[PDB]
Design a protein around this ligand. Sequence first.
Ligand SMILES: [Zn+2]
Ligand SMILES: [Zn+2]
Ligand SMILES: [Zn+2]
Ligand SMILES: [Zn+2]
Lengths: 65, 65
Amino acid sequence: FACVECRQQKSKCDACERAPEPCTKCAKKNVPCILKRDFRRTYKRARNEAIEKRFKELTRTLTNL
Amino acid sequence: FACVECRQQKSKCDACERAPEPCTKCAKKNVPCILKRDFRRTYKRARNEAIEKRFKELTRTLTNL
DNA sequence: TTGCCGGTACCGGCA
DNA sequence: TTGCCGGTACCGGCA
Ligand SMILES: [Zn+2]
Ligand SMILES: [Zn+2]
Ligand SMILES: [Zn+2]
Ligand SMILES: [Zn+2]
C-alpha cells in the first residue's frame, strides 16, 4: 500500500516495489518510513484552521472568567 | 511593489504593470488585490505550529486548575 | 528592505 | 476503502 508519509502528501509511494528499503520519497526526506495500514492523512490546513478558531474563543473566555 | 497575496506566496506579482486591474495571480484567485506597502507575509507553517504548542499547555493547565 | 525562483507540502477529486 | 495526478500553497535562500 502506501507509507504513512506518502499517504500524507497523497503522493506515489513505491514501498512493496523497492523492497525492505524505505519508500523512495521517504529517502529524499530520510524519515521513518512507517507502514500503518490503518492510517489516514491529516488535513493540516483545515485542521490548524479549526485549532486557531478554538484557541481563539478560549482567550475571549479569559476576557471574562 | 507586490500585492499582499503575492507577497504572501512570495510569487511574482505584476501590479504596477497590469494597470489599475488587480494583480494577475489575484485574478485566478479573484480576491481583493490590496497594496499595503508595509505588509509582511505570515509564516503559516511555523506560526500554526507555535499556536498548537501554546493551545496545548493551556489544556495541560486545565489538567490542573 | 523586498522581489521571486526552484522545490516541497498539501489536497480536491477522479478514479 | 485507497492510490495518486494536476494544480495550488508555502518558503528557504539568493539575490
Ligand atoms: Zn512512500
Ligand atoms: Zn515511505
Ligand atoms: Zn500580485
Ligand atoms: Zn495582486
